[PDB]
Amino acid sequence: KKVYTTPKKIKHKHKKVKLAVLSYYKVDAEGKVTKLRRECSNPTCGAGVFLANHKDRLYCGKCHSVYKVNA
Amino acid sequence: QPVNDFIDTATRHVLMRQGVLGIKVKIMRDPAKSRTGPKALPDAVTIIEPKEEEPILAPSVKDY
RNA sequence: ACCCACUCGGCACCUUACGAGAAAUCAAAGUCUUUGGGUUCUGGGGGGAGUAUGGUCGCAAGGCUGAAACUUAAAGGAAUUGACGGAAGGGCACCACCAGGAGUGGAGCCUGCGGCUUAAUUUGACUCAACACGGGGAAACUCACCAGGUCCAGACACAAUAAGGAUUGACAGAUUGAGAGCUCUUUCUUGAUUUUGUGGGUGGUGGUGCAUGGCCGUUCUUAGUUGGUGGAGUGAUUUGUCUGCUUAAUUGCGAUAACGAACGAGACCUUAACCUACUAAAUAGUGGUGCUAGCAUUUGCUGGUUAUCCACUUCUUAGAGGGACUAUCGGUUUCAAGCCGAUGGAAGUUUGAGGCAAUAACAGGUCUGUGAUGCCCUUAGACGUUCUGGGCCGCACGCGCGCUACACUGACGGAGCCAGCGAGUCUAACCUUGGCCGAGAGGUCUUGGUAAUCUUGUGAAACUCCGUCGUGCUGGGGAUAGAGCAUUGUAAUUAUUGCUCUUCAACGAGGAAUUCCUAGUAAGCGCAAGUCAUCAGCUUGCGUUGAUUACGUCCCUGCCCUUUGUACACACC
Ligand SMILES: [Mg+2]
Ligand SMILES: [Mg+2]
Ligand SMILES: [Mg+2]
Ligand SMILES: [Mg+2]
Ligand SMILES: [Mg+2]
Ligand SMILES: [Mg+2]
Ligand SMILES: [Mg+2]
Ligand SMILES: [Mg+2]
Ligand SMILES: [Mg+2]
Ligand SMILES: [Mg+2]
Ligand SMILES: [Mg+2]
Ligand SMILES: [Mg+2]
Ligand SMILES: [Mg+2]
Ligand SMILES: [Mg+2]
Ligand SMILES: [Mg+2]
Ligand SMILES: [Mg+2]
Ligand SMILES: [Mg+2]
Ligand SMILES: [Mg+2]
Ligand SMILES: [Mg+2]
Ligand SMILES: [Mg+2]
Ligand SMILES: [Mg+2]
Ligand SMILES: [Mg+2]
Ligand SMILES: [Mg+2]
Ligand SMILES: [Mg+2]
Ligand SMILES: [Mg+2]
Ligand SMILES: [Mg+2]
Ligand SMILES: [Mg+2]
Ligand SMILES: [Zn+2]
């Protein structure tokens, strides 16, 4: 046939990062637990799932993408 | 045409370790038994066997 | 000198063969396992090799005598069947010629092939038997090629990671051809479905058709293949299965150590031909009747009316029969199979045309039709797959199949007006009548048809008729090109196709060469079907008009058959 060429630079993949995440949740001196990161008002996501904090952005991940709640 | 009428054919690809073979089988059914169709080859022409005659015997006639 | 009968001894031929031989053959090559008349000479697998050596003869060249080492499983003989030949004898055929037809070869373009060019211009096939072939008419697709971007659709098994998260996904932005979370920023989400590793799979229009199946083409427009009982031979084998004649035919007559049979040919089947005989038909058509229009009127003539009724089956349809067997008669011939002519006949060239098709052969073609397939290659920066775009069409030129032409048997413009084989739409947008609108291409409103019921009588084309042009590259010819309009499609630029205007090339019958063909054939002519969203200058069939010339031969070419040679048999590659 021919075999191989390339101007170099191959592509990678994705990592899914690490993070021991959900410490986000503050409970006071025994034992009242208040929530950080506001949750989702889309009935497909029973207010368990949260909103990521970017710029302008507060976005619902479980809604694999859907809907822009901005506060 | 008798082909259509009388011989069954079949091919089967047998698949073995080294390559594959062709099986080809041909059966020719006795046309005598044909049951529904021609009972012999279009070839076939039987002559029916006569009958020895004891003729002569001067005229005469029977009555009933 | 001749003739006729005998008889010795010669050179030989013939037929037999009691007999001999491995056989071909042999009156000796016989009288040999039933082995002995007398005598001479030579051989003991093949090569080494008539070589080395010594002797000897010769002027010489060389003659006579004449080893071994080593190597090697065959060398050899006669006969058989094949296969082949640049031997000989017969045939057969418009993929051969003859007698001719219509041409290709010359030109323009269409299309395939080479070549060149190219990021790539995907690839198979190269005499008949590659080259309008792969049903190959590629805008995406197809697609195999090239420029780039995703995805795993990596079964299963073990291991590893790991519920404190094995893994999944993405809004915006960056990025990208892209409203691909491809990747990155950022930080949610997901929950044991994956992910990393090895082993093992899987896909592949990746290789190999010189590993295969299957299919197909070619030999083959051919006529060949085999067994029973007998005859010959130790045997392989042979004869049957052949000089001739005949046929399209190992088709037959005939000859005859063969008789009588089977596969293949023929039979058979399909379609085109013929039935005033049979069964019938408002999905086919005829006559009569009403209802009714036009013209004549003296009755008449020509139409309308999917049922206003009656009848019929000539035409159409398809069931069942019938029909032809080269019949009658005559010429010709071994008075055989046959062949030829006349009459009759729907039909008398295998009735015309197809379908089917024995044994064998080919390193024919096809792994690119197949979830047919061995083995090799590859398998996540993929040769898997998909998405975006290009390419197969690229243009100094060589080859092939075609289309259109060079006009006056014509082009043009009116007008006449006639086929057959097909095909059509359900979970859908196929075939389209009719009404309008538009010069046209087309558009728009409806409509009949899953169909002998509707498109459609497919009112097709050559053609026929009356005019115009008048031999002038002309009103023949329509290449190339400009500008505009429409149709198919997500997309038309490198211009899918259709229409209009303009532009108006080559080509004045085509060198050497070479193709096809014998009657509803050739040739001219259009149609339907395949392909198909759109596109036929292709193909498969169809009918329309309808000739000239053979009714022969072996000159060319091709091939079969004998005969013959063979040291070939993996068979002249
Ligand atoms: Mg000639
Ligand atoms: Mg000529
Ligand atoms: Mg074309
Ligand atoms: Mg090849
Ligand atoms: Mg593509
Ligand atoms: Mg693996
Ligand atoms: Mg492995
Ligand atoms: Mg495959
Ligand atoms: Mg082959
Ligand atoms: Mg093959
Ligand atoms: Mg012929
Ligand atoms: Mg014997
Ligand atoms: Mg013979
Ligand atoms: Mg009738
Ligand atoms: Mg006559
Ligand atoms: Mg080959
Ligand atoms: Mg195949
Ligand atoms: Mg091409
Ligand atoms: Mg051709
Ligand atoms: Mg005209
Ligand atoms: Mg207009
Ligand atoms: Mg309807
Ligand atoms: Mg002109
Ligand atoms: Mg013109
Ligand atoms: Mg068509
Ligand atoms: Mg084609
Ligand atoms: Mg011989
Ligand atoms: Zn949500």
PDB file of N, CA, C and O (backbone and C1' of nucleotides) in Angstrom, chain A residues 1 6 8-11 13-14 16 19-20 37 49-50 52-54 57 59 61-62 64-65 68, chain C residues 146 149-151 164-165 167-172 181-184 186-190 206 381 383:
ATOM      1  N   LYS A   1       0.828  -1.208   0.000  1.00  0.00           N
ATOM      2  CA  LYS A   1       0.000   0.000   0.000  1.00  0.00           C
ATOM      3  C   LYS A   1       0.859   1.253   0.000  1.00  0.00           C
ATOM      4  O   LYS A   1       1.163   1.799  -1.058  1.00  0.00           O
ATOM      5  N   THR A   6       2.126  11.520   8.765  1.00  0.00           N
ATOM      6  CA  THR A   6       1.931  12.397   9.948  1.00  0.00           C
ATOM      7  C   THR A   6       2.958  13.550  10.195  1.00  0.00           C
ATOM      8  O   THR A   6       4.177  13.337  10.292  1.00  0.00           O
ATOM      9  N   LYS A   8       3.053  14.879  12.935  1.00  0.00           N
ATOM     10  CA  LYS A   8       3.021  14.661  14.383  1.00  0.00           C
ATOM     11  C   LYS A   8       1.776  15.218  15.061  1.00  0.00           C
ATOM     12  O   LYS A   8       0.824  15.631  14.383  1.00  0.00           O
ATOM     13  N   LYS A   9       1.794  15.168  16.399  1.00  0.00           N
ATOM     14  CA  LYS A   9       0.685  15.572  17.268  1.00  0.00           C
ATOM     15  C   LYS A   9      -0.539  14.639  17.133  1.00  0.00           C
ATOM     16  O   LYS A   9      -1.397  14.834  16.265  1.00  0.00           O
ATOM     17  N   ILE A  10      -0.602  13.619  17.994  1.00  0.00           N
ATOM     18  CA  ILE A  10      -1.766  12.726  18.087  1.00  0.00           C
ATOM     19  C   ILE A  10      -2.782  13.316  19.062  1.00  0.00           C
ATOM     20  O   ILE A  10      -2.455  14.246  19.795  1.00  0.00           O
ATOM     21  N   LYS A  11      -4.004  12.788  19.080  1.00  0.00           N
ATOM     22  CA  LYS A  11      -5.030  13.292  19.996  1.00  0.00           C
ATOM     23  C   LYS A  11      -5.155  12.373  21.219  1.00  0.00           C
ATOM     24  O   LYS A  11      -4.810  11.198  21.147  1.00  0.00           O
ATOM     25  N   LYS A  13      -7.831  11.835  24.874  1.00  0.00           N
ATOM     26  CA  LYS A  13      -9.214  11.408  25.146  1.00  0.00           C
ATOM     27  C   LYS A  13      -9.927  12.340  26.125  1.00  0.00           C
ATOM     28  O   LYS A  13     -10.140  13.516  25.842  1.00  0.00           O
ATOM     29  N   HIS A  14     -10.329  11.797  27.266  1.00  0.00           N
ATOM     30  CA  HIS A  14     -10.752  12.629  28.382  1.00  0.00           C
ATOM     31  C   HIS A  14     -10.512  11.874  29.680  1.00  0.00           C
ATOM     32  O   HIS A  14     -10.319  10.657  29.676  1.00  0.00           O
ATOM     33  N   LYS A  16     -12.196  12.633  32.996  1.00  0.00           N
ATOM     34  CA  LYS A  16     -13.215  12.712  34.038  1.00  0.00           C
ATOM     35  C   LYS A  16     -12.614  13.240  35.362  1.00  0.00           C
ATOM     36  O   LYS A  16     -13.194  13.049  36.436  1.00  0.00           O
ATOM     37  N   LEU A  19     -11.212  14.482  42.003  1.00  0.00           N
ATOM     38  CA  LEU A  19     -12.104  15.155  42.957  1.00  0.00           C
ATOM     39  C   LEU A  19     -12.846  14.174  43.869  1.00  0.00           C
ATOM     40  O   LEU A  19     -13.603  13.332  43.400  1.00  0.00           O
ATOM     41  N   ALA A  20     -12.634  14.295  45.176  1.00  0.00           N
ATOM     42  CA  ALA A  20     -13.415  13.539  46.158  1.00  0.00           C
ATOM     43  C   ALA A  20     -14.747  14.256  46.452  1.00  0.00           C
ATOM     44  O   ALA A  20     -15.267  14.216  47.575  1.00  0.00           O
ATOM     45  N   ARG A  37     -24.339  25.395  46.432  1.00  0.00           N
ATOM     46  CA  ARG A  37     -24.734  25.124  45.044  1.00  0.00           C
ATOM     47  C   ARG A  37     -26.236  24.854  44.938  1.00  0.00           C
ATOM     48  O   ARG A  37     -26.739  23.842  45.421  1.00  0.00           O
ATOM     49  N   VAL A  49     -29.759  16.874  42.008  1.00  0.00           N
ATOM     50  CA  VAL A  49     -28.693  17.361  41.127  1.00  0.00           C
ATOM     51  C   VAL A  49     -28.438  18.863  41.322  1.00  0.00           C
ATOM     52  O   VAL A  49     -29.349  19.610  41.685  1.00  0.00           O
ATOM     53  N   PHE A  50     -27.202  19.307  41.096  1.00  0.00           N
ATOM     54  CA  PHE A  50     -26.846  20.697  41.397  1.00  0.00           C
ATOM     55  C   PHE A  50     -26.448  21.532  40.187  1.00  0.00           C
ATOM     56  O   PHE A  50     -26.383  21.045  39.063  1.00  0.00           O
ATOM     57  N   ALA A  52     -23.555  23.880  38.451  1.00  0.00           N
ATOM     58  CA  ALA A  52     -22.146  24.251  38.434  1.00  0.00           C
ATOM     59  C   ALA A  52     -21.994  25.767  38.391  1.00  0.00           C
ATOM     60  O   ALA A  52     -22.821  26.474  37.812  1.00  0.00           O
ATOM     61  N   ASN A  53     -20.929  26.267  38.997  1.00  0.00           N
ATOM     62  CA  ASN A  53     -20.728  27.705  39.076  1.00  0.00           C
ATOM     63  C   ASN A  53     -19.633  28.198  38.139  1.00  0.00           C
ATOM     64  O   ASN A  53     -18.449  28.031  38.432  1.00  0.00           O
ATOM     65  N   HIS A  54     -20.015  28.798  37.013  1.00  0.00           N
ATOM     66  CA  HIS A  54     -19.023  29.422  36.132  1.00  0.00           C
ATOM     67  C   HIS A  54     -19.185  30.960  36.142  1.00  0.00           C
ATOM     68  O   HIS A  54     -19.247  31.587  37.210  1.00  0.00           O
ATOM     69  N   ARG A  57     -23.227  31.893  33.855  1.00  0.00           N
ATOM     70  CA  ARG A  57     -23.430  30.485  34.127  1.00  0.00           C
ATOM     71  C   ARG A  57     -23.732  29.967  35.533  1.00  0.00           C
ATOM     72  O   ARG A  57     -22.909  30.048  36.443  1.00  0.00           O
ATOM     73  N   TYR A  59     -25.325  26.086  35.714  1.00  0.00           N
ATOM     74  CA  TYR A  59     -25.793  25.123  34.710  1.00  0.00           C
ATOM     75  C   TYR A  59     -26.071  23.731  35.260  1.00  0.00           C
ATOM     76  O   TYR A  59     -25.344  23.235  36.124  1.00  0.00           O
ATOM     77  N   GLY A  61     -26.105  19.857  35.102  1.00  0.00           N
ATOM     78  CA  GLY A  61     -25.367  18.785  34.461  1.00  0.00           C
ATOM     79  C   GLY A  61     -26.168  17.535  34.161  1.00  0.00           C
ATOM     80  O   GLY A  61     -25.938  16.898  33.132  1.00  0.00           O
ATOM     81  N   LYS A  62     -27.090  17.179  35.058  1.00  0.00           N
ATOM     82  CA  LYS A  62     -27.910  15.965  34.919  1.00  0.00           C
ATOM     83  C   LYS A  62     -28.780  16.096  33.689  1.00  0.00           C
ATOM     84  O   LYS A  62     -28.810  15.192  32.843  1.00  0.00           O
ATOM     85  N   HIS A  64     -28.457  16.646  30.747  1.00  0.00           N
ATOM     86  CA  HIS A  64     -27.135  16.381  30.141  1.00  0.00           C
ATOM     87  C   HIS A  64     -26.506  17.658  29.616  1.00  0.00           C
ATOM     88  O   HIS A  64     -25.294  17.770  29.526  1.00  0.00           O
ATOM     89  N   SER A  65     -27.365  18.628  29.335  1.00  0.00           N
ATOM     90  CA  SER A  65     -26.979  19.969  28.968  1.00  0.00           C
ATOM     91  C   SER A  65     -28.065  20.958  29.369  1.00  0.00           C
ATOM     92  O   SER A  65     -27.784  22.084  29.776  1.00  0.00           O
ATOM     93  N   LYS A  68     -30.617  26.957  31.098  1.00  0.00           N
ATOM     94  CA  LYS A  68     -29.716  28.001  31.587  1.00  0.00           C
ATOM     95  C   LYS A  68     -30.333  28.835  32.717  1.00  0.00           C
ATOM     96  O   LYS A  68     -30.912  29.903  32.468  1.00  0.00           O
TER      97      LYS A  68
ATOM     98  P     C C 146      -5.802   6.535  -0.971  1.00  0.00           P
ATOM     99  O5'   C C 146      -5.762   8.127  -1.021  1.00  0.00           O
ATOM    100  C5'   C C 146      -4.999   8.804  -2.006  1.00  0.00           C
ATOM    101  C4'   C C 146      -5.398  10.256  -2.152  1.00  0.00           C
ATOM    102  C3'   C C 146      -5.541  11.064  -0.872  1.00  0.00           C
ATOM    103  O3'   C C 146      -4.294  11.476  -0.346  1.00  0.00           O
ATOM    104  C1'   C C 146      -7.370  11.523  -2.306  1.00  0.00           C
ATOM    105  P     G C 149      -7.341  15.220  11.053  1.00  0.00           P
ATOM    106  O5'   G C 149      -8.862  15.261  11.535  1.00  0.00           O
ATOM    107  C5'   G C 149      -9.507  16.509  11.758  1.00  0.00           C
ATOM    108  C4'   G C 149     -10.989  16.367  12.022  1.00  0.00           C
ATOM    109  C3'   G C 149     -11.420  15.328  13.044  1.00  0.00           C
ATOM    110  O3'   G C 149     -11.188  15.702  14.386  1.00  0.00           O
ATOM    111  C1'   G C 149     -12.835  15.202  11.176  1.00  0.00           C
ATOM    112  P     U C 150     -11.135  14.561  15.505  1.00  0.00           P
ATOM    113  O5'   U C 150     -12.644  14.070  15.576  1.00  0.00           O
ATOM    114  C5'   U C 150     -13.010  12.883  16.258  1.00  0.00           C
ATOM    115  C4'   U C 150     -14.494  12.637  16.151  1.00  0.00           C
ATOM    116  C3'   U C 150     -15.007  11.388  16.840  1.00  0.00           C
ATOM    117  O3'   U C 150     -15.208  11.598  18.222  1.00  0.00           O
ATOM    118  C1'   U C 150     -15.893  11.486  14.658  1.00  0.00           C
ATOM    119  P     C C 151     -14.794  10.469  19.276  1.00  0.00           P
ATOM    120  O5'   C C 151     -15.727   9.231  18.907  1.00  0.00           O
ATOM    121  C5'   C C 151     -17.128   9.250  19.123  1.00  0.00           C
ATOM    122  C4'   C C 151     -17.758   8.009  18.544  1.00  0.00           C
ATOM    123  C3'   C C 151     -17.154   6.697  19.025  1.00  0.00           C
ATOM    124  O3'   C C 151     -17.722   6.259  20.248  1.00  0.00           O
ATOM    125  C1'   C C 151     -17.256   6.694  16.663  1.00  0.00           C
ATOM    126  P     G C 164     -17.946   5.111  49.635  1.00  0.00           P
ATOM    127  O5'   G C 164     -17.346   6.580  49.541  1.00  0.00           O
ATOM    128  C5'   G C 164     -17.375   7.310  48.319  1.00  0.00           C
ATOM    129  C4'   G C 164     -16.245   8.304  48.274  1.00  0.00           C
ATOM    130  C3'   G C 164     -15.156   7.999  47.256  1.00  0.00           C
ATOM    131  O3'   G C 164     -14.512   9.233  46.950  1.00  0.00           O
ATOM    132  C1'   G C 164     -14.234   7.881  49.406  1.00  0.00           C
ATOM    133  P     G C 165     -13.922   9.518  45.492  1.00  0.00           P
ATOM    134  O5'   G C 165     -13.997   8.101  44.784  1.00  0.00           O
ATOM    135  C5'   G C 165     -13.369   7.890  43.527  1.00  0.00           C
ATOM    136  C4'   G C 165     -14.148   6.907  42.696  1.00  0.00           C
ATOM    137  C3'   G C 165     -14.640   7.448  41.360  1.00  0.00           C
ATOM    138  O3'   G C 165     -14.517   6.432  40.375  1.00  0.00           O
ATOM    139  C1'   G C 165     -16.485   6.703  42.656  1.00  0.00           C
ATOM    140  P     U C 167     -11.712   4.076  34.807  1.00  0.00           P
ATOM    141  O5'   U C 167     -13.028   3.797  33.957  1.00  0.00           O
ATOM    142  C5'   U C 167     -13.600   4.807  33.139  1.00  0.00           C
ATOM    143  C4'   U C 167     -15.047   4.508  32.837  1.00  0.00           C
ATOM    144  C3'   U C 167     -15.811   5.575  32.068  1.00  0.00           C
ATOM    145  O3'   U C 167     -15.567   5.548  30.672  1.00  0.00           O
ATOM    146  C1'   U C 167     -17.094   4.900  33.916  1.00  0.00           C
ATOM    147  P     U C 168     -15.733   6.887  29.795  1.00  0.00           P
ATOM    148  O5'   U C 168     -17.276   7.251  29.939  1.00  0.00           O
ATOM    149  C5'   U C 168     -18.271   6.375  29.435  1.00  0.00           C
ATOM    150  C4'   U C 168     -19.661   6.921  29.635  1.00  0.00           C
ATOM    151  C3'   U C 168     -19.952   8.262  29.003  1.00  0.00           C
ATOM    152  O3'   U C 168     -20.123   8.195  27.607  1.00  0.00           O
ATOM    153  C1'   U C 168     -20.882   8.193  31.164  1.00  0.00           C
ATOM    154  P     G C 169     -19.475   9.340  26.697  1.00  0.00           P
ATOM    155  O5'   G C 169     -20.408  10.605  26.963  1.00  0.00           O
ATOM    156  C5'   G C 169     -21.778  10.555  26.612  1.00  0.00           C
ATOM    157  C4'   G C 169     -22.565  11.659  27.257  1.00  0.00           C
ATOM    158  C3'   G C 169     -22.201  13.070  26.856  1.00  0.00           C
ATOM    159  O3'   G C 169     -22.703  13.426  25.583  1.00  0.00           O
ATOM    160  C1'   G C 169     -22.521  12.961  29.193  1.00  0.00           C
ATOM    161  P     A C 170     -21.893  14.473  24.680  1.00  0.00           P
ATOM    162  O5'   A C 170     -22.294  15.886  25.285  1.00  0.00           O
ATOM    163  C5'   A C 170     -23.657  16.198  25.533  1.00  0.00           C
ATOM    164  C4'   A C 170     -23.794  17.439  26.375  1.00  0.00           C
ATOM    165  C3'   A C 170     -23.021  18.637  25.865  1.00  0.00           C
ATOM    166  O3'   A C 170     -23.763  19.293  24.844  1.00  0.00           O
ATOM    167  C1'   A C 170     -22.694  18.369  28.218  1.00  0.00           C
ATOM    168  P     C C 171     -23.494  20.810  24.401  1.00  0.00           P
ATOM    169  O5'   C C 171     -24.186  21.647  25.545  1.00  0.00           O
ATOM    170  C5'   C C 171     -25.441  22.243  25.317  1.00  0.00           C
ATOM    171  C4'   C C 171     -25.663  23.349  26.299  1.00  0.00           C
ATOM    172  C3'   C C 171     -24.849  24.598  26.066  1.00  0.00           C
ATOM    173  O3'   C C 171     -25.315  25.383  24.991  1.00  0.00           O
ATOM    174  C1'   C C 171     -24.824  24.067  28.353  1.00  0.00           C
ATOM    175  P     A C 172     -24.324  25.700  23.773  1.00  0.00           P
ATOM    176  O5'   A C 172     -23.462  26.952  24.271  1.00  0.00           O
ATOM    177  C5'   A C 172     -24.081  28.138  24.744  1.00  0.00           C
ATOM    178  C4'   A C 172     -23.081  29.048  25.407  1.00  0.00           C
ATOM    179  C3'   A C 172     -21.802  29.289  24.626  1.00  0.00           C
ATOM    180  O3'   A C 172     -21.940  30.313  23.666  1.00  0.00           O
ATOM    181  C1'   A C 172     -21.260  28.710  26.840  1.00  0.00           C
ATOM    182  P     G C 181     -20.725  20.148  19.609  1.00  0.00           P
ATOM    183  O5'   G C 181     -19.348  19.996  20.374  1.00  0.00           O
ATOM    184  C5'   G C 181     -19.349  19.812  21.780  1.00  0.00           C
ATOM    185  C4'   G C 181     -18.274  18.858  22.225  1.00  0.00           C
ATOM    186  C3'   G C 181     -18.742  17.437  22.522  1.00  0.00           C
ATOM    187  O3'   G C 181     -17.653  16.530  22.336  1.00  0.00           O
ATOM    188  C1'   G C 181     -17.922  18.421  24.495  1.00  0.00           C
ATOM    189  P     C C 182     -17.639  15.454  21.141  1.00  0.00           P
ATOM    190  O5'   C C 182     -16.089  15.113  20.955  1.00  0.00           O
ATOM    191  C5'   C C 182     -15.644  14.237  19.929  1.00  0.00           C
ATOM    192  C4'   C C 182     -14.219  14.513  19.517  1.00  0.00           C
ATOM    193  C3'   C C 182     -13.289  15.046  20.599  1.00  0.00           C
ATOM    194  O3'   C C 182     -12.789  14.024  21.450  1.00  0.00           O
ATOM    195  C1'   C C 182     -12.959  16.241  18.565  1.00  0.00           C
ATOM    196  P     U C 183     -12.598  14.279  23.029  1.00  0.00           P
ATOM    197  O5'   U C 183     -11.526  15.461  23.116  1.00  0.00           O
ATOM    198  C5'   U C 183     -10.167  15.262  22.739  1.00  0.00           C
ATOM    199  C4'   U C 183      -9.416  16.569  22.652  1.00  0.00           C
ATOM    200  C3'   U C 183      -9.470  17.445  23.895  1.00  0.00           C
ATOM    201  O3'   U C 183      -8.510  17.071  24.863  1.00  0.00           O
ATOM    202  C1'   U C 183      -9.972  18.754  21.986  1.00  0.00           C
ATOM    203  P     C C 184      -8.808  17.276  26.426  1.00  0.00           P
ATOM    204  O5'   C C 184      -8.710  18.855  26.626  1.00  0.00           O
ATOM    205  C5'   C C 184      -7.457  19.529  26.637  1.00  0.00           C
ATOM    206  C4'   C C 184      -7.640  21.025  26.742  1.00  0.00           C
ATOM    207  C3'   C C 184      -8.411  21.534  27.955  1.00  0.00           C
ATOM    208  O3'   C C 184      -7.637  21.599  29.144  1.00  0.00           O
ATOM    209  C1'   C C 184      -9.205  22.615  26.000  1.00  0.00           C
ATOM    210  P     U C 186      -9.772  24.856  34.393  1.00  0.00           P
ATOM    211  O5'   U C 186     -10.926  25.486  35.274  1.00  0.00           O
ATOM    212  C5'   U C 186     -11.560  26.673  34.849  1.00  0.00           C
ATOM    213  C4'   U C 186     -13.056  26.562  34.945  1.00  0.00           C
ATOM    214  C3'   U C 186     -13.614  25.374  35.704  1.00  0.00           C
ATOM    215  O3'   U C 186     -13.380  25.402  37.116  1.00  0.00           O
ATOM    216  C1'   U C 186     -14.857  25.689  33.734  1.00  0.00           C
ATOM    217  P     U C 187     -14.466  25.857  38.214  1.00  0.00           P
ATOM    218  O5'   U C 187     -15.620  24.754  38.144  1.00  0.00           O
ATOM    219  C5'   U C 187     -16.931  25.073  38.599  1.00  0.00           C
ATOM    220  C4'   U C 187     -17.920  23.943  38.422  1.00  0.00           C
ATOM    221  C3'   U C 187     -17.772  22.745  39.370  1.00  0.00           C
ATOM    222  O3'   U C 187     -19.077  22.261  39.694  1.00  0.00           O
ATOM    223  C1'   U C 187     -17.789  21.990  37.155  1.00  0.00           C
ATOM    224  P     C C 188     -19.581  22.172  41.216  1.00  0.00           P
ATOM    225  O5'   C C 188     -21.014  21.489  41.109  1.00  0.00           O
ATOM    226  C5'   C C 188     -21.173  20.184  40.579  1.00  0.00           C
ATOM    227  C4'   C C 188     -22.112  20.188  39.401  1.00  0.00           C
ATOM    228  C3'   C C 188     -22.770  18.860  39.079  1.00  0.00           C
ATOM    229  O3'   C C 188     -23.907  18.608  39.876  1.00  0.00           O
ATOM    230  C1'   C C 188     -21.879  19.770  37.106  1.00  0.00           C
ATOM    231  P     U C 189     -24.057  17.197  40.613  1.00  0.00           P
ATOM    232  O5'   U C 189     -24.476  16.218  39.439  1.00  0.00           O
ATOM    233  C5'   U C 189     -25.505  16.586  38.543  1.00  0.00           C
ATOM    234  C4'   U C 189     -25.408  15.807  37.264  1.00  0.00           C
ATOM    235  C3'   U C 189     -25.312  14.303  37.412  1.00  0.00           C
ATOM    236  O3'   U C 189     -26.564  13.696  37.661  1.00  0.00           O
ATOM    237  C1'   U C 189     -23.706  15.043  35.849  1.00  0.00           C
ATOM    238  P     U C 190     -26.650  12.442  38.653  1.00  0.00           P
ATOM    239  O5'   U C 190     -26.278  11.214  37.731  1.00  0.00           O
ATOM    240  C5'   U C 190     -26.869  11.051  36.454  1.00  0.00           C
ATOM    241  C4'   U C 190     -26.062  10.076  35.652  1.00  0.00           C
ATOM    242  C3'   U C 190     -25.742   8.780  36.385  1.00  0.00           C
ATOM    243  O3'   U C 190     -26.758   7.810  36.201  1.00  0.00           O
ATOM    244  C1'   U C 190     -23.749   9.713  35.500  1.00  0.00           C
ATOM    245  P     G C 206     -11.240  -1.932   0.005  1.00  0.00           P
ATOM    246  O5'   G C 206     -10.487  -2.995   0.906  1.00  0.00           O
ATOM    247  C5'   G C 206      -9.944  -4.164   0.340  1.00  0.00           C
ATOM    248  C4'   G C 206      -8.471  -4.256   0.619  1.00  0.00           C
ATOM    249  C3'   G C 206      -7.744  -5.365  -0.119  1.00  0.00           C
ATOM    250  O3'   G C 206      -7.348  -4.959  -1.414  1.00  0.00           O
ATOM    251  C1'   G C 206      -7.176  -5.419   2.180  1.00  0.00           C
ATOM    252  P     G C 381      -5.115   5.366  18.764  1.00  0.00           P
ATOM    253  O5'   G C 381      -4.641   6.050  17.409  1.00  0.00           O
ATOM    254  C5'   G C 381      -5.343   7.180  16.906  1.00  0.00           C
ATOM    255  C4'   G C 381      -4.932   7.520  15.499  1.00  0.00           C
ATOM    256  C3'   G C 381      -4.492   6.339  14.637  1.00  0.00           C
ATOM    257  O3'   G C 381      -4.980   6.529  13.318  1.00  0.00           O
ATOM    258  C1'   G C 381      -2.801   7.975  14.654  1.00  0.00           C
ATOM    259  P     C C 383      -5.440   2.485   7.999  1.00  0.00           P
ATOM    260  O5'   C C 383      -6.017   1.683   6.756  1.00  0.00           O
ATOM    261  C5'   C C 383      -7.231   2.068   6.128  1.00  0.00           C
ATOM    262  C4'   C C 383      -7.945   0.871   5.570  1.00  0.00           C
ATOM    263  C3'   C C 383      -8.752   0.083   6.599  1.00  0.00           C
ATOM    264  O3'   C C 383      -9.925  -0.471   5.985  1.00  0.00           O
ATOM    265  C1'   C C 383      -7.073  -1.303   5.691  1.00  0.00           C
TER     266        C C 383
END
